Structure formats: C-alpha cells, structure tokens
C-alpha cells in the first residue's frame, strides 16, 4: 500500500493506490508470504499468485479502494490493516502549509504529529516508502510549484506499481488550494 502527499505554501496534493489484499490460511504461512510481498520480492500479480500457491495461502486482491478524499478543503489519506483481531489505521490530513498525522489507538484516532510549511510525506511498507522518497528527491526542485508536484506524485505512484505487487497500477489523486486548519478535522475524527 502507498499514500503520498506534497504540502506546499499554496496547497497540497495527495495520491493513493487502490489495492486491498486479504490473506487466508495458517499464520506462519501468511507471515512468510507477507514478508516476501512487502520486501519488493514479488513484482507482478502473476508472481504473487504463484507464491500464494507455494505457501498454501489463498489471496484475494481488490483494486478499487479509495484511500484519499477531500473534506472541507482538507485532504485525507488512509492506510489500514487487520491482524489477529487488531485493526490498525493511519491517517494523513493536509492542506496549504498544514499537515497532521493520526493513528487509530484502540477506538480513538489519535494525533501523533503535525507540521507547517513545505513537506513530502510517504505512507507505506519500508520498500514502497524508499522507492517513492527516491523518486521525489530525484525530480523535485527548490522552486517547483503545486502543478509540478502533481506530475511528480504521478511518477512516484507509477514507479512504485512497476516494482511491487503490494500496490495497484490504478491510483487516485486529490488536490487543494485551501489553507483550512487540518487540526479541526483530526478533532472531528477523534471520537468514533
């Protein structure tokens, strides 16, 4: 999975893949497949099914999950898991010169960080994060605008989907010029 965002002085852009993977089978087997998938080892959807067969894990892949949206001028990106009855979730809130990060601890979406000014934020496994970070640093220039950031994030999303089967080729992009306070949105989410 991968959610990436660029926060600038005049707005913010956010992109997310649409892949959702469910695993079914014994825990040591699922854990072995997961490690291979989140390491960049499995590149194609063909190699993923061959590996699931090998480890005796049934895998369903769904490529229509909207991971980014825009509520009140604030962009919201989310990555989530399910493991041993534990639901884990991380959200990114972004607007012009504004950002916040919150995690689902138990039943409450809890703010873990925030910042002002310009930033690039990548949400993903260690592999997808290093690849997107490398693509961003390679193409971003100091005086680049929000429009250049759109092209860059598209290139990041395409480069990652070419290297791993943990991300889908299809992706979404939301953008805003609004400077609405993201902390307001994180408070609204805090309960439920």
């Amino acid at each position: 999975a991968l959610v990436i965002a660029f926060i600038g002085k005049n707005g913010a852009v956010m992109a997310g893949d649409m892949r959702e993977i469910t695993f079914e089978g014994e825990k040591p087997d699922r854990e072995k497949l997961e490690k291979e998938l989140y390491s960049g080892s499995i590149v194609t959807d063909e190699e993923m099914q061959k590996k699931a067969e090998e480890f005796g894990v049934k895998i369903t892949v769904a490529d229509c999950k909207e991971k980014v949206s825009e509520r009140n001028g604030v962009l919201v990106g989310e990555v989530s898991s399910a493991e041993g009855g534990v639901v884990k979730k991380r959200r990114l809130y972004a607007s012009a010169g504004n950002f916040a990060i919150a995690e689902l601890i138990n039943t409450e979406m809890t703010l873990t960080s925030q910042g002002k000014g310009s930033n690039f934020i990548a949400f993903g496994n260690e592999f997808t994060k290093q690849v997107a970070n490398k693509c961003f640093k390679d193409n971003w220039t100091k005086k680049s605008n929000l429009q250049d950031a759109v092209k860059i994030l598209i290139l990041c999303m395409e480069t990652v989907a070419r290297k791993t089967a943990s991300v889908s080729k299809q992706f979404m992009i939301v953008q805003t010029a609004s400077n609405a306070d993201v902390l307001k949105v994180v408070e609204k989410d805090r309960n439920s």
Partner: peptide
C-alpha cells in the same frame, strides 16, 4: 488479514522541504 499496507505498522516517512 485485511489490506496490503505495512504503512500502518512501518512508520510514516516525513521529509522536510
């Protein structure tokens, strides 16, 4: 085991610009 993100487990990458 719903979803393919280590993004929930692995920590988010934050780069200052």
């Amino acid at each position: 085991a719903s979803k393919d993100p280590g993004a929930v487990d692995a920590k988010p990458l934050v780069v200052e610009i």
